[PDB]
Amino acid sequence: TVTDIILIHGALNRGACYDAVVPLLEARGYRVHAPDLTGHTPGDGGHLSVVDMEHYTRPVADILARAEGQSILLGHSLGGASISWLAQHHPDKVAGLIYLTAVLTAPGVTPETFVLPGEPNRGTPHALDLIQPVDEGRGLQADFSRLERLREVFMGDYPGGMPPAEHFIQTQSTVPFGTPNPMEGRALEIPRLYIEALDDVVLPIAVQRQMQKEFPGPVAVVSLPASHAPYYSMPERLAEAIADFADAPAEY
Numbered sequence: 188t189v190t191d192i193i194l195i196h197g198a199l200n201r202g203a204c205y206d207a208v209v210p211l212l213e214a215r216g217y218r219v220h221a222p223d224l225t226g227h228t229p230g231d232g233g234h235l236s237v238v239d240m241e242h243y244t245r246p247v248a249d250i251l252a253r254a255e256g257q258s259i260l261l262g263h264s265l266g267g268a269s270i271s272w273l274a275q276h277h278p279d280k281v282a283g284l285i286y287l288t289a290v291l292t293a294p295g296v297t298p299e300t301f302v303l304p305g306e307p308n309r310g311t312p313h314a315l316d317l318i319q320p321v322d323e324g325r326g327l328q329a330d331f332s333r334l335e336r337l338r339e340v341f342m343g344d345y346p347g348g349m350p351p352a353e354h355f356i357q358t359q360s361t362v363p364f365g366t367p368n369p370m371e372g373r374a375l376e377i378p379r380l381y382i383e384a385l386d387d388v389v390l391p392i393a394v395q396r397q398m399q400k401e402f403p404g405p406v407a408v409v410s411l412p413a414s415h416a417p418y419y420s421m422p423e424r425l426a427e428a429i430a431d432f433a434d435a436p437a438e439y
């Protein structure tokens with residue numbers, strides 16, 4: 188019944204960041220997609236071209252349109268805002284939701300709740316320190332005056348200096364940060380899995396667990412001993428857990 192798995196990147200990233208995971212899931216008999224969201228393909232217009240979430244998430248809605256059966260949606264970090272939005276508008280196409288140290292907000296809550304300081308167990312101050320606003324808060328861009336800090340904070344999981352340029356973009360749209368989760372009704376029956384990254388310092392495990400705690404209804408959880416990017420440091424263990432979920436998301 189599940190034919191496709193769609194892996195969705197987070198802020199400042201592109202689908203290619205999943206390159207170590209895609210073939211492993213393909214060996215589990217799945218068709219695997221890792222698309223660029225809107226604004227994430229060099230030459231497409233970049234951050235100011237994103238109008239709203241329907242626009243931002245439209246490359247996935249396209250994939251879900253032509254899938255033979257049901258799909259698993261995975262979001263990394265900010266990518267969770269997209270899979271929640273998509274689940275609500277394509278609940279008939281999504282059989283499961285995977286939040287990989289990802290923004291999991293309750294219906295009506297925007298991601299900024301957990302990024303900005305607050306109580307309890309809210310805040311990603313390492314990211315706000317290193318990622319700065321541009322174009323009057325319509326864009327965010329990394330602080331390139333602190334390259335080693337950027338690497339050790341966000342790309343510490345990369346095997347062997349840094350990931351290749353194909354994995355990243357220069358400027359991110361603030362559109363997903365400010366959009367509330369519209370999941371209601373049918374979408375809240377979709378089985379949900381949170382994969383925690385225990386040593387994440389971008390999104391601390393306390394914040395991760397606080398998000399699970401405040402979402403209404405059950406959230407399954409598996410824990411990985413990784414920092415911000417498990418798709419770089421343990422693709423095998425990560426793809427294994429994704430495929431076991433896809434095999435039977437209702438039971439996992």
Ligand SMILES: Cc1c(COC(=O)[C@H]2[C@H](/C=C(/Cl)C(F)(F)F)C2(C)C)cccc1-c1ccccc1
Nearest residue numbers: 197198199264265302311314315318329341390
């Ligand atoms: C951003 C980035 C990432 C994914 O990070 C995220 O999406 C963070 C986002 C939170 C926040 Cl507050 C923010 F978006 F602002 F960072 C979560 C949603 C907590 C992964 C790997 C490298 C870089 C990066 C690539 C090039 C240069 C620097 C870093």
